[PDB]
Each structure stands twice: as C-alpha cells, then as structure tokens.
C-alpha cells in the first residue's frame, strides 16, 4: 500500500501499572532488621544460655 508522509510521531514504549502499595503486612514489625539478623539473635540467645 502507499503512505503519506507521517502525521504523527511515535515509538514503541513500555506501560506499567502503579502498585498503589499502602498495604502493610501482619508481621511488618520485623522489617527494620533483615531476616538473618533474627535467625542469629535466636542462635546467639541459645549460645549465651
């Protein structure tokens, strides 16, 4: 087929959603410290005892 010169420009692009977040967890009180700092506060407590 034939085409005119372009009337609008574009390029392929990516659309993503915006996870609203705002959804805390039940045990979200453990986030400050990483998981390994709790697996080792529990191994130090058995040790020191």
């Amino acid at each position: 087929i034939d085409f005119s010169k372009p009337f609008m420009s574009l390029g392929i692009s990516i659309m993503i959603k915006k996870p609203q977040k705002s959804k805390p967890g039940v045990f979200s009180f453990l986030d400050p410290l990483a998981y390994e700092i709790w697996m080792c506060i529990v191994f130090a407590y058995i040790g020191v005892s």
């Binding site: 400050p32 410290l33 990483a34 390994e36 080792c40 040790g47």
Partner: protein, 41 residues
C-alpha cells in the same frame, strides 16, 4: 532505606562469641587450678 543487613552488625556478633569463648576459658582455668591444687592438697 532498606532493612538493616547482617554485615551492618556482623561485628557485635563477634564480640559476643569472643566473650563467650573468653568466659569458658576463665572458668576452666580456675577449674584446672582448683583441680590440681586440691589433689596436691
């Protein structure tokens, strides 16, 4: 601001083990001393 990592505190846990190790030494040295000196009587 992510969760605090083990490396960040990996040092406290050493002083703990080291202290626990020193503790057992201090105890068994007294024991050793108190042991022989008793048999020697």
């Amino acid at each position: 601001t992510s969760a605090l990592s083990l490396s960040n505190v990996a040092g406290v846990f050493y002083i703990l083990v080291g202290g626990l190790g020193l503790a057992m030494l201090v105890a068994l040295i007294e024991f050793c001393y108190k042991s022989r000196a008793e048999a020697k009587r």
